[PDB]
Copies of this chain bind each other. A is one copy, B any other.
């Protein structure tokens, strides 16, 4: 089956969409992807997951906690209260603590 649309394709489904593909799904998008989901997003694979972006990657929530894989190579792990673990985007490996204690448990031979 082949489908060629010289303009825009608009799909409006009031019910539930089921897609069952036995082969490979290849998506080549020449623009952007804006995915807005009101419910959950549960992705499951059983061989591998590959996430690649030439630029920056940000995984965040409304709580203000995020994992940022910088486009310059910086790595930033931030929690809601503002404690940060940083690696190296042309700086130093820094464990910013916001003036709060850090705990080691079952520490063996640090």
Contact = CB atoms under 8 A, between A and B. Distances in A.
B22 A11 contact: no
B41 A49 contact: yes
Interface string A17-43: 111111111111111111111111111
A70 B75 contact: no
B15 A20 contact: no
Most buried by B among A9, A46, A92: A9
Contacts of A24: 16-17, 29, 31-34, 39
Contact of A73 (B41, B63, B89): B63
Copies of the chain in the assembly = 3
A31 B38 contact: yes
B77 A75 contact: yes
Most buried by B among A1, A66, A105: A1
B42 A32 contact: yes
A43 to B, nearest CB: 4
Given A74-B79, A94-B105, A31 B41 contact: no
Interface of A: 1-67, 69-75, 77, 79-81, 83, 85, 87-89, 91-110
